[PDB]
Amino acid sequence: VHEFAKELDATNISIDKVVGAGEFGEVCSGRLKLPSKKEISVAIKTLKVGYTEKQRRDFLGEASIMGQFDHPNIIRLEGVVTKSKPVMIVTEYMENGSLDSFLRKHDAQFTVIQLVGMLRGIASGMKYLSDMGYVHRDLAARNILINSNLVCKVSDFGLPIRWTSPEAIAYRKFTSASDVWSYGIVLWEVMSYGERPYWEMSNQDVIKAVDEGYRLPPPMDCPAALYQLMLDCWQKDRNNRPKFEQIVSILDKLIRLKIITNLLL
Numbered sequence: 314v315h316e317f318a319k320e321l322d323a324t325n326i327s328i329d330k331v332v333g334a335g336e337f338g339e340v341c342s343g344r345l346k347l348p349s350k351k352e353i354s355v356a357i358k359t360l361k362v363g364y365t366e367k368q369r370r371d372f373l374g375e376a377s378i379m380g381q382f383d384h385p386n387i388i389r390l391e392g393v394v395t396k397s398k399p400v401m402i403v404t405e406y407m408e409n410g411s412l413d414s415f416l417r418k419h420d421a422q423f424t425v426i427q428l429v430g431m432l433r434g435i436a437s438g439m440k441y442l443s444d445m446g447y448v449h450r451d452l453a454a455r456n457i458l459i460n461s462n463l464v465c466k467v468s469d470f471g472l473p474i475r476w477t478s479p480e481a482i483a484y485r486k487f488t489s490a491s492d493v494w495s496y497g498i499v500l501w502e503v504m505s506y507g508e509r510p511y512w513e514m515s516n517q518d519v520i521k522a523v524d525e526g527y528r529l530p531p532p533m534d535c536p537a538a539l540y541q542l543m544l545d546c547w548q549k550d551r552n553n554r555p556k557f558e559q560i561v562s563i564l565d566k567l568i569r570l571k572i573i574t575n576l577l578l
């Protein structure tokens with residue numbers, strides 16, 4: 314674990330608030346004093362008291378992965394605390410929380426360029442992720458964090474039917490191309506301002522409908538360019554999906570759209 318993750322001294326860490334709950338324990342916000350004396354805002358995942366050896370290894374497993382990534386659109390690991398308790402994973406702090414709950418609070422309040430900026434960031438982080446040989450398997454708006462300047466960063470490296478490609482659901486064929494499928498769903502989620510993919514359809518129907526060629530409809534006022542991008546990410550043949558590098562290239566052009574567009578077949 315300490316191969317990629319710096320051990321932090323707990324004395325350099327202040328806890329200021331409880332910002333939510335994770336699988337393994339409370340999530341908190343606070344501050345970290347760095348070796349250079351600079352103080353930064355951090356988010357802190359804590360491991361519940363009374364954890365088992367397996368929980369600890371799985372908890373900290375996320376940090377070993379996260380520690381190998383250094384990119385503006387991947388959540389930055391500051392370090393871990395294992396020598397004292399509670400055990401913690403400490404990252405940079407993201408003021409505006411999860412992308413999906415953030416967007417739900419601001420329905421139709423952003424410009425298309427702003428949304429594209431967010432989408433470009435996610436795509437760039439994923440381009441780096443796939444460059445490093447990692448498959449996320451859980452790419453979802455709720456796993457993207459967004460900061461006070463609206464910069465989006467991929468998180469949650471712990472590993473979800475609605476976000477999973479058809480072939481990954483069918484026989485666990487996870488590749489960067491199934492991540493690209495997931496990105497398509499995230500793209501829908503963003504243009505929908507945090508709407509749940511496939512709403513509350515039963516899982517079997519989401520599975521069958523998608524397998525039959527049915528796709529999420531264009532969100533309200535979605536530019537055709539962004540909708541077609543979703544459809545590309547959702548090609549049945551995974552070899553026909555664009556690579557993250559092309560997705561990044563596509564979004565950089567759109568950032569530099571007037572045409573505006575139950576599942577569709």
Ligand SMILES: COc1ccccc1-n1c(-c2cc(O)ccc2C)cn2c3c(=O)[nH]c(=O)n(C)c3nc12
Pocket residue numbers: 332333334335336340355356357358375388402403404405406407408409410411455456457458468469470
């Ligand atoms: C995606 O966000 C999370 C989901 C589950 C649990 C914690 C957070 N989680 C994480 C996080 C994510 C990681 O993958 C690893 C380590 C951490 C600290 C950072 N933040 C923040 C954050 O920096 N700011 C927030 O407002 N919220 C709600 C956050 N929730 C999380």
